[PDB]
Amino acid sequence: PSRVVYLGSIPYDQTEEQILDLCSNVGPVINLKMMFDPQTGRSKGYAFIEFRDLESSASAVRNLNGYQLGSRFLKCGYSSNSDISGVSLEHHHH
16 A cells, blocks of 8 residues: 555546545545646546545545546556655556
8 A cells, every 4th residue: 555546547627626626535635646738738637646644545545446527437546656756657657
């Protein structure tokens, strides 16, 4: 486990604020990394979310995985990273 989770299969128009609001139902979020196209504002379909504690990140993996958001079923797993700084490395191997 990690306090950081990966969240994937996110509908592209969902904003950082909407993903933050979603994740808040799990627990407090201390960091959130997403990517958006500078011309369209559309995201790339994923986020890394760092929670305040491991109970919360466990709950994220259990309860955000399979969560229906719009027409999509989200995927959620633990990040291989213990902190938010290295997550870009991880994602560019997928």
